[model samples]
Target: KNIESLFDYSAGQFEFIDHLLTMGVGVHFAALIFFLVVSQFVAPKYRIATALSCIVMVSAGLILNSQAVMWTDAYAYVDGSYQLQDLTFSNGYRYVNWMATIPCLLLQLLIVLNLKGKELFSTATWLILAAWGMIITGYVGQLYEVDDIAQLMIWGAVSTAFFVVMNWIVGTKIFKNRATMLGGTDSTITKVFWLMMFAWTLYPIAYLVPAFMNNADGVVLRQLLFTIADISSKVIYGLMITYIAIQQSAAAGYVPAQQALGRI
Candidate 1:
């Protein structure tokens, strides 16, 4: 069984996860500054999109830093390998971060698309609910990751069902919004949709890693997958959205955005 707290990890395994967690904290904080400063380069209307990115980065930075501390607190250098301490480290920190940030992330897309009236309210409600469903179910699955594969699989299956519904909603919304956006930005908009889907899918695969490997090695791999997914989903995704906002702002003759684009 791949009980992370039960296994004594090799120095390499311990170092890998610890370093990656620290790196994740650093990246998110740096991205937070980027979003905060770049917000001005977009039009006033699109600034909300950049502000949402800032919120995501702050949430991610805090959670990643917390995870690093939890990683340290949960393990000890006993003899040679790193062994579990009196306390158990929980992956629930990640879920908590997702709960806080996913809504903001989805809202960024809605804001960037400039949705209004009943359509905006309806999509926002469905997307937020679906995101909550996906994360909460997956969170429960991780609780059983080591002790009971059956429970894990059942919860994981339920989580994926929610994910599929969320995916359909996001896909439809993106495609519909794409039609109304400025013509030149179609590719960037498409990139946002693809990147979001690709990065989000890594999370479920990471959740399943323990099922196949069932060892401390699996724990390392899982962390690796998560770190990659988090950066891509939160950081790069933000950049893509910011780009679209800036491009649209420039096209609409926003002076600051036009200057930022060097089109003066």
Candidate 2:
């Protein structure tokens, strides 16, 4: 077993899950900067979606930051495995943050993409459920008490299955929506979508990190990788959405949905 690699001056234990949580806070603030940038440069309609992204990220940021300092405890690598101060493990808070924000991330995309009434509604709902499925199952798989890892394998299988549906629907419903969102330029959006796909692949791999390495080592690696993924999926993707929103505003006959009522 090994300990978390990165260290901080005050022993923030900031290198473990705290590291992931702290990075998340930074990304949320980064996304906030983009929000202000969009507010001034983009149309009102775009501003709203960007604003929503900021709000969601800020919510996640606070939750994660609080956990990083208050709840997240440093873990140790015992003889051949990870062990908490009192032989305890608590990944529950992290998943709660994940379940909330993963869905919010998709909602941010849909709002910017401006998917249709039913398509938007359904896609958003499904993606949220899928996010829940992915994290919850992975949570079960983390149950160290279960000696029969076969149970872990089964939950893992179920987890992948939910994510498959979520991923497929994004392609058919949003990414491939040339047939859906009217005649808008979507290259920026497309690039962001693919970027999200690439970043998310690390989640499952991170989920399995403990299998081959000591708990402390695996957790540190997982947190770092997850931090990278969250940055791509949330911060980078939000930036692209800002550009897309601007592009959407510039489309030939684009009309602000609320232009006639005052706000666009």
Candidate 3:
């Protein structure tokens, strides 16, 4: 149980996690400005997508800041290793934050896709439900990572089941018409789809790190993997979606969008 156990960590190891969280916070806040500024480049219809991106960044920045503060408070240098006397820190907040943001992230896609009426309502409902299922199950499984192996495996499998459903919805239904919707397979949506898929795959890999490398080092590695996933999925993914919205707006003859595209 790498999570629950006490281990002697080098000063560098402790500082590394601290700085990474700080950097994560900084990166998200920085991206928020870009999203806000770029939203005006797209038509009003697609601005919601950038707004969702902004929401994702705000939540991510705040949550990462909370984690960093908690980390500093949770540990103290004693007997050469950083350990807690009374305080405890868990990565649970990230999961809680994801529960809110992942759906928004997925919804941004549906909005950019321009789904309407029953199709939009039904697909958005499915996406929200599936995203909650995936995040909740994974969060539950991680709770047992430092205690029970069997429970972790069981809940993890359940979470992955939901993940598969999400991938199916996004890859098959939402992504199926992207080529036509965006005017070709070379469109920004195509690249974003694959990038999102790849970035999402990293979460499960990070979640499973305890199964193989349960140590202080694995903790650091897991955090690093999660931060990488967050930036790619939220920030980079948002930027790409913003690009698509601008393109769509230009095609729809929005003069501002056309000018923005020309300048870029």
Candidate 4:
């Protein structure tokens, strides 16, 4: 009876909008899977462990929050007040979201403060940090009440700057000078680094355009923009994670081609 009451499938038509929604969910799920797969291959020395851990923690927060939304009366209102029936989920999950950054932040500080000019300060490291910082800041902003469309646009701009700076650092400092000094030539990892840089550059524009438009025909444009931004964020995130994993593995003498030949 509860199942019959809750599931009213016969009342609605199967529309194109429903198919689009399903496709969007599919893409989002695929992106999450990509991130997990990439994380597993990443090197152990860097904060890949921490990054994966944060993913798990954030996922748990989302799951718990979803359950709370379904079972409890904790509605997230614009004015921040609710009745018993109006109880929707609040931003409580955001509190746990901030904790997700501790590990990655620690790793970044380790590089900037402690391991500057060391092996950890490579192009891959810079790209990874830029990506990590974007994700961390975005989530942190949501944790507060700053989850507006304009704020997301600002974050996109910030992330764009990060990507540009990272590319400059890699091209000028790492590939040309440091690689030569270290007697190393460009390889697959270096190429991947550049690809990720270009990929990250697109994210800001993708986000900024929708924010500027802000016309969704009575629909919640803010939520729509947020969804688009989320997809972009996760795609780049997975790529960055994969790049870091591959680069770090190479740095640690774990060449993928010669895994069975023992560590280099």
For all predictions, the C-alpha RMSD in Å is 1.6, 5.9, 1.6, 9.8
* Per-residue lDDT over 173-220 for candidate 2, one digit per residue giving the tens place of the 0 to 100 score: 565664344335455667766887898887777666655654444556
List the candidates ranked by TM-score, beginning with the highest.
Answer: 1, 3, 2, 4
- Tally clashes: model 2: 1
Per-residue lDDT over 196-220 for candidate 3, one digit per residue giving the tens place of the 0 to 100 score: 8899999999988888988889988
How high is the lDDT of residue 50 in model 1? 95
Instruction: Give candidate 2's whole-model lDDT.
Output: 0.65
**Each model's number of backbone clashes?**
0, 1, 0, 7
Give the C-alpha lDDT of model 4: 0.41
State in Å the error of residue 112, model 1.
1.6
Model 4, range 51-146, lDDT digits (tens) per residue? 553464345335433533442332222333222244333333432443443234234323211134555456446656765666556544333222
lDDT of 4 at 196: 41
lDDT of 1 by residue, 40-103 (tens): 8999888989999999998888888888898899898999989888766777778877887998
lDDT of each model, Cα atoms only?
0.87, 0.65, 0.85, 0.41
- State which candidate has the highest TM-score: 1
Between prediction 1 and prediction 2, the one with superior lDDT is 1
Clashing pairs in 1: none
